[PDB]
């Protein structure tokens, strides 16, 4: 249900100054938030697919849901990541 | 590396959705990179409150303050007590 805490903590630590510290419950909080982020975006994409009578959540559905919900800035880096992923 | 995040766990979260039937191969891949972007931005915004309180330890209340202040985090409002 949650991404591994070690991975979440590593991303968090990379974001802040090298001398900063992160409390255990702050890492757990972000763990919860990023599952909610996935669920929130997925809900937008899934209702759209249901309205269009489509059975598969595609990558375009996820990207479009992100654009609709205020995460349009993610679209370009995600496309580059996925394209280098499948290259 | 972002590729290290487990796709099976991302797919499991996605499958909790009541209207999800089938998921493309690329959807969890996109969410892995999105998770990195989201964690980084949320952490940086919470860290504003850490430093504003003259602290060097990021605390859960710093994340809650960032959630309440920023529109991109509106969807997290029910996580805040």
């Amino acid at each position: 249900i949650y991404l591994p805490i070690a991975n979440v903590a590593r991303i968090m630590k990379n974001a802040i100054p090298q001398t900063g510290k992160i409390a255990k419950d702050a890492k757990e909080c972000v763990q919860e938030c990023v599952s909610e982020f996935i669920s929130f975006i997925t809900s937008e994409a899934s209702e759209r697919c249901h309205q269009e009578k489509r059975k598969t959540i595609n990558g375009e559905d996820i990207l479009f849901a992100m654009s609709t919900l205020g995460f349009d800035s993610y679209v370009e880096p995600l496309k580059l990541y996925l394209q280098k992923f499948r290259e | 590396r972002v590729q290290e995040l487990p796709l099976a766990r991302i797919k499991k979260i996605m499958k909790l959705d009541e209207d999800v039937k089938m998921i493309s191969a690329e959807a969890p891949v996109l969410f892995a990179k999105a998770a990195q972007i989201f964690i980084t931005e949320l952490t940086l915004r919470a860290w504003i409150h850490t430093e504003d309180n003259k602290r060097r330890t990021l605390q859960r209340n710093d994340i809650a303050m960032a959630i309440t202040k920023f529109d991109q985090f509106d969807f997290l409002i029910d996580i805040v007590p």
């Binding site: 929130f40 209702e47 609709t68 919900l69 | 969807f75 029910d78």
Partner: peptide
Amino acid sequence: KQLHRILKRRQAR
């Protein structure tokens, strides 16, 4: 931009 999806997530329950 998020309000209606936030609501709908509450409504689905």
